[model samples]
Every structure is written in structure tokens, then in C-alpha cells.
Target: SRRRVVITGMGMLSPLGLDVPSSWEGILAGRSGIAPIEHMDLSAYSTRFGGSVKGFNVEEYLSAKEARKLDLFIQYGLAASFQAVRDSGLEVTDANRERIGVSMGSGIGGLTNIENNCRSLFEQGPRRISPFFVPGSIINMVSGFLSIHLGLQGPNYALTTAQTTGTHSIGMAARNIAYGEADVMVAGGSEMAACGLGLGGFGAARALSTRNDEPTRASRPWDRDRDGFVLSDGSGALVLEELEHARARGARIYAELVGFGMSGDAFHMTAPPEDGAGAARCMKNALRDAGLDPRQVDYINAHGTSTPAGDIAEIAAVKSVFGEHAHALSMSSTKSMTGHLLGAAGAVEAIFSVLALRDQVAPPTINLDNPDEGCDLDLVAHEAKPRKIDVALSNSFGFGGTNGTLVFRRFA
Candidate 1:
């Protein structure tokens, strides 16, 4: 018998908005989260606009002192993790504490803090850098703080997959329950890399949108004028409970996470397979894992990060996997609204997929004014579409040429 894992609760801090309702509203309304990079002095860079979580007051989710010491990534982790735990309605006392676990990820760790602290270290010597430099910026502390704050004395761990972080974390968390390693797990990712290194690194790769004149339209996936992906910051998290346990507690189930597949492009360190072969394998492998075929899926939350090569490669991969049934699925790049969140994108898009299943409405792929012919999919472009989504799939590919896809069933 296989253990059943169900998502019981979720939370997020995104460019679209914070929390579930606000974010959902922003998504459905087809609003882009991209704006002028207000978090830092981005004027020095060519592409100064990005999808940043605006008006996110730390006091809304954390204490002043705590927020001050923690890096942006950890602050988001702590905030989103808190929301997921509270929403999951799971009660873990000292008795079962050893059995619960946490497996979260942060793609960029604390690039913002690293940029700042390292500057102090170089210019003013080590004495100027705060002692909290290590703990505050370390990616692992995302899971560390969650475990510490929630009293979850179990297997506290984190993943640092550049982009597949979210899907990988969810898959691993479910794996723990499926293998009897844990009864309950809080899984997902949080990311905040909106600073010098964050912008400059991608800029050097020429993987960032250079549409400085228009921040909102910068990240237009599959569009003919698409330049590159826009960097965004924020977190997305989910709570997974052993199915029977959730039922025992009379908890609400959003949907069943039945399938997950991961693939490596192996072709390039930062680009996808030319023919989308690796990505195709990612989608096919996940569908196969769920014991379903391509035709069964009704929607796909695409990894359309708005980059030229990535957008085309991803769609090509989907066509390879879905064949004719690819025609039946409606695809949307929520990244068009929230921007590419690196390690946190898969998690955020996973939540977006779940919400699509829940609400029976496909979110819009905004700024898709001009569609690239190679990347052909019925991307719900420009407006929300009403649909009955049953079996849905979410795709995520990262800079390491890593690809991940997951299938979800609307249980309700």
C-alpha cells in the first residue's frame, strides 16, 4: 500500500499579492506584479524593472526584531511557513514532533544580503559585517527557522535547486510520507534575490528582460518581442498531510498530488534541450508516474519564464509529451504576472495550479500580445477562462537545465 499525501494548507507572498485571496485576485485580474525595482538602487543596471513583492510589511508577518536579523529569504520563509502551518490545522505536540518534518528550499539563498555584507567586508573590513551574516543569508536557515519556530522537531531539511526547488521539495516531502519517514510535512519554497548580485548575475547571462521602459510588459513569455525573464522575489509554501491523518482530523483537502517527475537537460548548464526533449521527458515521466496519459490533463501551469530560448523549448517539450492531447490543455504562465522566482517559482506555480483546479478558472498569461510560432499551446492569453479543470499539470524548468513537472487531481 502506498501512503497518500494531500495538501492541507498553503500560503504565499508574491508580486501579485500576499496571502491566498489577494494573490488569487491579482492573478485572475491579469495584473502583472512587475514594477520599477524599488527594493534597491536598480538605476545602475540596464534592466531596472522586475516583479517585486510590493508593500510587504514585515510586521504583518514577523516581529520587528526578528525581521531585522533575518534575511529577506528567511523572513519570507518564516512568514509563509507560519501561514501554511496555521492553515494546515495540524497539531504537533512533543510526542509526534519527532515524526513531523520540514523540507523547503531557497534558490538564491540571500543574494541581497551577500551583496550587502560582502560589500561591508571588502570596503570596511570584517569588523563592519554583522555577525549574523552567515545565519541570516544561509539558504538552509529557511528550513532551520521553520523547524525552530514551529517546534517541528523532525527531519528539518532544505533544497537548493536553482529553479526546480519547489516541485522537488514537494516531491521529497511526499516521498518522506510515502516511505513512512514522516506523517506530516511542510513543503514548498521562498525566495528573495532582488538586489545587485540578483540583477547583475542574470543580466550578465543576458537572461533578464531589458525592457526598462515598461516593467510590467518586460516578462512576456512566448511573445514575439520577448527578451528574457524578469527577476522576482517572494515565497510560496504548502502543507502536506498523510491522507488518512488529514481525514482523521476532518481537514479540507485542496487536491491530490498524485504525480511528480524531474529531469535534467544535461545539454547545457543554463539552457534547456534544443528540442525540448528533456522537458518532454519531465512532463511524460510525471504523467506516467501518475498512471495517466497526456490526454487526461486539462491545464498546465507552464514554466514560461518569458525568456526567448526557454519559452520555445518548454512548449516544444510539451508538444512532444502531449502530442494531440496537448491541444486539449490550456496553458498559462503565471510568471507573466509574478515573474521568475527562481527556487520559489515551482512552489508558487504549484499553488497557482491548485487554485486553478479549485476555482475551475484558468488564470491569464498576460502580456502575451504576440505569440511565438514555435511555442504553440492554448495559453489562456490576456483573459481568465472559465473551465472545468480535473487533472492538471504544472511545469517548472530551472537554469541548471533542470526540469520538473507535477500532476494534480481536483478531488472535489
Candidate 2:
């Protein structure tokens, strides 16, 4: 028999809150984390609002000197990872340290750091660039730093799959355990791209919401008034352990990660086909991996980024895959509250999915006043709803036409 995997611990640093419990509380209460981008000068930018992680004290997670040497993304990732490791109670002794590893990533890693360093190099000469610039800004540094901090001796790497970074990292980490490569894996993604250049670049692509006046109501997924995704900053991490290993250690299991699937849209670079063929296939692949029928799923944490085309495309995909069962199963986009965390979206949404199963409730897709034409599914609009969720699915689709799906089930 193949090795089974389960989520033993979870952590998050979202715009909504600093930790998992607080974030989930805000999510269940239909609170919006989106606000004005006050940290940077957005005078020249069209989109002036986003979801920024507020009240974060890096000193609580790392020393001031250490935190100053890394980018915000790395700090957020390390904080979440530390929370997860502590939650799991998996003591890394000399014997067990060799069996643990880390797999984390970011979609736009260290953008602000890179932008600042470039300005320094151009204005003050190459000598002005800090020696730590290269290691500080790279995507893999999160995994590298975490390994060194925790003394994890097994595999350590990061995957950058646009917005699908976290889902892919967690899925591949699960695979490493399932294939007998590791017994425990810390996996997820982090991102902090709310800087001047980051905002200006994404705005140039026309992928940000312009609802500056009503920042709280901007990331309204499935709503008729949505314009684009709300870029945000955050990180999420999960401690994945082999079933037998978790049991041997007397660890508490949150949920079983039964399935994972990936697919690519061969049609376009950033846009999916109107039919949502790629997304439908991706969900189907996950269902196949889990050996489950479509009717078995109870809820979906949608990748509804509030983009007009992307929201409708995901709905079309759900309908095609679930058919009549779509109406019976509830689906909600927590992005309506947390905005879109980009690379961190997948891992944070995965944590939400598992929590939904744990609490037997579906978090709401707030700000969905009027659902768009094709979005007739039960969106759990405006408020959380209690329901029997035996199985939950989380979907993440990203730029360059990448798609990832994770199937989590209530542990028996």
C-alpha cells in the first residue's frame, strides 16, 4: 500500500490576522482585510488600495539583526513556518532532524527588495548594493533559511508556479513523504509585493482593482461589480506528516490530504479559455487521484479572484465537473475577505479548506451582493454557513495558465 499523508499542523499570516485562529475568526465573521496602501507613495498609481498584512512584528519571530537582513516575504514565511513547527510539537532531535524538510515559495519573491537595490546600484554605484541582496531577495531563501533555523537535514527547496506556488509546494512535499523520501515536510508559500514597483507593474498589466474609494468592498468575488484581483501580502505554512509517523508521534491530525492535481492551459498566457477546459480537467484529475466521485465533495475554496473573466471561468469549470451536484455543494471564495495573496493564496486557502472541514462550516464569499450570470452556485454569500463537510477541495489558478487542486478530507 502507498504511504498516506495528513496535515498535522497549520499556520498563517494573512492581511486579516496574524495567526490561524484570528484569521479564521475574521473570515467567519465576513470581515474584509483590504485597505488603502499607506506604506508606499501611491500618488502616481491608479490602484491605490490592497490587502496589506498589518501589525506584524518581525522581532517576535526573529532577532532584529536577522530580520533586517531578509526581505519581508522571507520573514513572513519564517514566521508561519515557526508557528507550524511549534504547533505540530515535532521535536527535531538528531535522529528525526534528518527526516524533516521544507518546501516553500513565492510568486513574486522579494520584489520590493529588488527594486530598492536596483535604485541604489543605479544612483550610488554597484558598491552601494548590500552583500545580502542576492540571498535576501531570492524565492528559495525561505526554504533555505528555515532549514538552517530548524536543522532540517532532508530535502529543502522552493517552487515558483505563479499563484499556484503554495499548492504546488504542499503537493510536492506530500509526494516526497508518500514516496518515502521524508517523514515530515514543512510546506507553503509567502508573498509581499505591495511596494511601489510591485504595485506599478501589476497595475500596468491591468490586473488590480481600482475601487480605491471603497477598498473594503473591492475584492468582491462572483459579484457583478468586481473589476480585478486585490493584490495582498501574506504567508501560510503546513506541517505534513506521513500517517504512520504522525500516529507514532501521537500528533493531532487536522485533515487528510488525499489528492493533488495539476494542469496547464495551453490556450493563453494569462487568460483561461471561456469554456474553462483546463480548470475542469484539473479538478477531474484531483477527483481521480482521490478515487472519489464528484458528489463526494461537500465544499470548494474557489480561486475566485474577482476578475470578470476568471470568476466566470472557474464557475464554468465547476459546473462542467460537478454538473447537477454543483448546486448541492457549497463553494466560497475567502479572497472576498483576504483579497488575493497571489502565491500565498493557495496555502492560506488550503488552511481555510481544512478548517472548514474541521468546524463543519463554509466560510463566506463576502461582498457578493449580486452574483454574476454564470455564478449561480451556492456561494455562501455574506456569511458563513454550517454544513457537513466530509471532503473539501481548494482550487488555485495562476498566470502562464497554471492550475492546481488539493482534496482534503475529514480524518476518520
Report the number of the highest-TM-score candidate. 2
Q: Where does candidate 2 clash, by residue pair?
A: none
Quote the lDDT for 368 in model 2.
94
Q: What's the TM-score of each model vs. the native?
A: 0.97, 0.99
lDDT of 1: 0.86
For candidate 1, the 10 contiguous residues with the lowest summed lDDT are 38-47
Candidate 1 lDDT over residue span 119-147, tens digit each: 99899999999878888888878788788
Tens-digit lDDT string for candidate 2 (352-375): 999999999999999999998978
Off by over 4 Å in 1: none
Provide the overall lDDT of each model, using Cα atoms, as 2-decimal numbers. Answer: 0.86, 0.93
Please state every model's RMSD to the true fold in angstroms. Answer: 1.2, 0.8
What's model 2's TM-score? 0.99
